[PDB]
Amino acid sequence: TDTENYLGEIGTLTASNIQSWLEGRMHLVEGLASQLALLDQPDEANIARQLEQPVFSRNFASVYLGEAASGTFTMRPYDAMPEGYDPRTRAWYKDALAADRLIVTEPFVDAGTGEQILAMSLPVRHAGQLLGVAAGDMKLETLTAILNSLGYAFLVSDAGKILLHPDSGLVLKTLAEAYPAPNIVPGVHEVSSQFVSFTPVKGLPGVTWYVALVL
Numbered sequence: 001t002d003t004e005n006y007l008g009e010i011g012t013l014t015a016s017n018i019q020s021w022l023e024g025r026m027h028l029v030e031g032l033a034s035q036l037a038l039l040d041q042p043d044e045a046n047i048a049r050q051l052e053q054p055v056f057s058r059n060f061a062s063v064y065l066g067e068a069a070s071g072t073f074t075m076r077p078y079d080a081m082p083e084g085y086d087p088r089t090r091a092w093y094k095d096a097l098a099a100d101r102l103i104v105t106e107p108f109v110d111a112g113t114g115e116q117i118l119a120m121s122l123p124v125r126h127a128g129q130l131l132g133v134a135a136g137d138m139k140l141e142t143l144t145a146i147l148n149s150l151g152y153a154f155l156v157s158d159a160g161k162i163l164l165h166p167d168s169g170l171v172l173k174t175l176a177e178a179y180p181a182p183n184i185v186p187g188v189h190e191v192s193s194q195f196v197s198f199t200p201v202k203g204l205p206g207v208t209w210y211v212a213l214v215l
Helices: 003-038 044-051 054-059 091-099 140-147
Strands: 062-067 073-076 116-126 129-139 152-157 162-164 187-190 195-200 209-214
Touching: 003 044, 003 054, 003 062, 003 116, 003 129, 003 140, 003 187, 003 195, 003 209, 044 062, 044 073, 054 062, 091 116, 091 129, 116 140, 129 140, 140 152, 140 162
Parallel strands: none
Antiparallel strands: 062 073, 062 129, 116 129, 152 162, 152 209, 187 195, 195 209
């Protein structure tokens, strides 16, 4: 009843921290879309100029626009993509269009670097016509560091998919795969035997994700 209160308080503060951090990144991606919709002439040079702002490289691994007309892909900071890369075939693109709003993706593998990332993406229209999908992505280790700024903490979806974990190998495993498992219910429960607490992250669009604390 006491160590339960204490884990409940740390889980709450841990969730509201990752919430604030992710929300700030969301806002920047929202503002990137509004900036691009505001271009009077949205040609390649103007799009690239908007993407080259240092605030984007300081706060994302990269930001980018996948264009609807022919798959033109502008990414800053720029590095190479695979031969025949077409952003329109990728989940961060197709899911932004299907949801018609900002989404936050589960982890995937960056097509250029092989790193594990997640993206925030949303459609960009100009005068009501689709320009493409704008996104920023961030490395999972960056997020995992935020989560574990102080036993340990990981991040897991409502369905049981591990999203962030100090053991990087456990990322994208199910909880049943990681612990051959506790049931995801908000609160604290005994499960070497350990305490494990689930706290929802508020404010995230389209997902229910939990901070898991292990003590």
